[PDB]
Design a protein around this ligand. Structure first.
Ligand SMILES: Nc1ncnc2c1ncn2[C@@H]1O[C@H](COP(=O)(O)OP(=O)(O)NP(=O)(O)O)[C@@H](O)[C@H]1O
Ligand SMILES: Nc1ncnc2c1ncn2[C@@H]1O[C@H](COP(=O)(O)OP(=O)(O)NP(=O)(O)O)[C@@H](O)[C@H]1O
Ligand SMILES: Nc1ncnc2c1ncn2[C@@H]1O[C@H](COP(=O)(O)OP(=O)(O)O)[C@@H](O)[C@H]1O
Ligand SMILES: Nc1ncnc2c1ncn2[C@@H]1O[C@H](COP(=O)(O)OP(=O)(O)O)[C@@H](O)[C@H]1O
Ligand SMILES: Cc1cn([C@H]2C[C@H](O)[C@@H](COP(=O)(O)O)O2)c(=O)[nH]c1=O
Ligand SMILES: Cc1cn([C@H]2C[C@H](O)[C@@H](COP(=O)(O)O)O2)c(=O)[nH]c1=O
Ligand SMILES: Cc1cn([C@H]2C[C@H](O)[C@@H](CO)O2)c(=O)[nH]c1=O
Ligand SMILES: Cc1cn([C@H]2C[C@H](O)[C@@H](CO)O2)c(=O)[nH]c1=O
Ligand SMILES: [Mg+2]
Ligand SMILES: [Mg+2]
Ligand SMILES: [Mg+2]
Ligand SMILES: [Mg+2]
Ligand SMILES: [Zn+2]
Ligand SMILES: [Zn+2]
Ligand SMILES: [Zn+2]
Ligand SMILES: [Zn+2]
Lengths: 169, 170, 169, 170
């Protein structure tokens, strides 16, 4: 059967970098891959199919696809759980990267569902913006409104450890 | 801050055994622990626990010098457990939670899913597949009783299987 | 091919307990195992063949042996490296537990050689006898002479973290 | 105390890439680092380093506020590296070492073996097997040049293989 590996953690924790490392491993082994991002390059702080609904993946999966790679999974509809389950049942390995928690420390539900299904969970850490320790597990929003769905980078979000998050809040 | 470690996997994967290992570690270090299970008193694998109905009941048993909180069968607790645990971590208390990730129908257990999202560390445990004997079982399959997803029981009702064996047997 | 897993760390770090957990996994799967200790029970703080030389293992390995489990590997002749390599080549998984360092912080050479060969290395920690933190990586000798080969338990050896070791020395 | 992390595996397993990742982590935290390679200056994967012949030469480049020491290609350093590293750990400096565990003939590299024994954490990396394409290569096989076990080189001389493929090709 296919195995599901979920790579999660706060922003800047190396989730996309790890995901791309896995893509490279499959490519080096001459295994066909399909790479997806929500609505073209997967960029760290490769080319992907940009899709809206998880079900669109099926358009781009071939008989000999061995691995499916999905970035920013927190932005996908939770139906991604059942789509992934079906890929695993068909012998296709799946690798997902995404945020575990919003900047308000609420779960991203799609990520949470995938963590449930995962054969392996890799929790990544970032360097804390405040204290410089390699212990950041949260993201804090420093600009924009309070919205939990709000695309952005270092102008809007910083990685912090739990103590620094509580101090700053 | 406290760290949250979530130990998950199918039945018979050693989740409770691992949880009790960490209890032992804290006890050897003369660190105060609080141990909980959902509503008898014995946390026993295939230690004494406070048997509680609701996550909000944990506060009564958490003293000022509690260093670790240990919770088994977390799939059966109300999802309010998420904010309770977050508060403990903010106060510097380490939390260890053991529970099933998936029902026998491969639906997520909500509370476990939420705690996986808050976790600093996730330990996915495997079991031996009842069918092929490999150490690759990640799922539980229900072999007796009804189709119900909430149904307490052991070997008389559930086996651990790998994905391929689960699909084959279904 | 067989895979080699080495479980190492100071005394009281759970190495035998982990080794026995692996034995149980193979037994539950109805896979034949062969279990060895140096010169009858493997006891944590199962029955084993007590042997002197690593080459004696071959007397007790059968065509359908799937796993070989060796405790206290630090006490075996370094020829255990080549014996293990041959088992792996034959498709037999090998699990070794043993101390990485003496109480003088010198390497146990047999363990070191096996760490080199290992597919997976599990470093176990103990609770520090002095500070109570789960950070003990060393063993300190508190009775007996200075000998590095000296069988014993808690009457002779304690597990300590590096800072506590240096403080106590 | 400082902790020692040893990153090992066959060629092309990402050892240097992982080592440089940890360098980056310390640099982002504004922690002083010292980076070494055996005797040009660039540590480059398949950052600037001090190129040194002997482990005893590291002391010159370690300042009072050095937080991390990073060492690549440790298999080529004298086994005296063991006591040098032990001393750094005793002084509170974290050490990260990357190196091969085994020669192409499957003999242990002595210095790597000693550091594996001192390590707090061992990361075994794999490569893609040149023969079967699976992510299961743990060995290096020499495909050109002589039988020598000390022979600097890359893809023109060495491939990564799994155990079964190594045995088959031999
Ligand atoms: N606070 C930080 N900690 C660690 N690395 C950082 C930090 N800020 C920037 N970086 C850089 O970010 C890289 C990781 O980038 P990447 O793999 O894109 O992370 P990510 O987890 O995908 N982030 P995101 O997509 O925003 O949720 C690191 O290798 C660093 O170069
Ligand atoms: N300092 C300590 N830290 C952790 N556990 C300890 C300590 N002292 C005693 N124990 C107990 O020891 C058990 C681990 O025993 P075991 O699996 O035999 O360890 P080991 O690493 O094999 N020791 P050794 O064979 O002496 O090299 C733990 O589960 C505890 O019950
Ligand atoms: N299929 C199986 N795989 C592994 N262990 C099993 C299996 N069936 C029974 N066991 C026994 O169950 C123990 C694990 O029990 P436990 O820690 O209570 O697991 P969990 O809390 O995950 O159900 C094992 O050590 C073993 O003795
Ligand atoms: N057989 C292989 N397996 C994996 N990666 C390989 C292989 N051959 C070449 N590469 C490339 O080598 C990179 C790893 O290089 P590097 O970090 O310098 O490894 P090491 O220091 O272990 O030799 C991979 O990311 C990949 O780009
Ligand atoms: C798989 C599964 C288990 N259970 C119960 C059976 C056990 O009482 C408990 C799991 O025990 P365990 O994870 O310690 O082995 O959960 C359900 O109620 N529904 C399910 O779908
Ligand atoms: C496998 C092997 C590599 N080497 C050299 C080749 C490379 O120069 C270096 C390993 O590089 P790497 O581990 O960064 O890929 O070691 C030997 O000298 N002897 C050997 O047996
Ligand atoms: C932390 C956080 C990030 N994001 C976005 C910012 C980035 O575009 C992406 C993480 O790479 O997710 C949110 O939309 N909500 C959040 O709460
Ligand atoms: C730490 C240490 C333990 N031992 C012995 C004590 C125990 O009998 C065994 C570890 O379980 O190894 C030594 O012989 N030398 C040492 O340096
Ligand atoms: Mg990203
Ligand atoms: Mg249990
Ligand atoms: Mg032992
Ligand atoms: Mg390299
Ligand atoms: Zn911080
Ligand atoms: Zn099976
Ligand atoms: Zn200590
Ligand atoms: Zn191969």
């Amino acid at each position: 059967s296919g195995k599901l590996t979920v790579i999660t953690g706060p922003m800047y924790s190396g989730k996309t970098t790890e995901l791309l490392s896995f893509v490279e491993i499959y490519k080096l082994g001459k295994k066909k891959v399909a790479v997806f991002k929500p609505k073209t390059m997967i960029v760290s702080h490769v080319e992907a199919h940009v899709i809206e609904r998880p079900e669109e993946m099926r358009k781009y999966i071939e008989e000999d696809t061995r691995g499916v790679f999905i970035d920013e999974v927190q932005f996908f509809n939770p139906s991604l759980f059942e789509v992934v389950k079906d890929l695993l049942d068909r012998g296709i390995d799946v690798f997902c990267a995404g945020l575990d928690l919003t900047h308000k420390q609420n779960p991203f539900e799609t990520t949470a569902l995938l963590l449930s299904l995962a054969d392996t969970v890799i929790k990544k850490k970032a360097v804390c913006h405040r204290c410089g320790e390699y212990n950041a597990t949260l993201t804090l929003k420093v600009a924009g409104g309070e919205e939990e769905i709000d695309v952005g980078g270092q102008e809007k979000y910083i990685a912090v450890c739990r103590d620094c998050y509580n101090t700053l809040k």
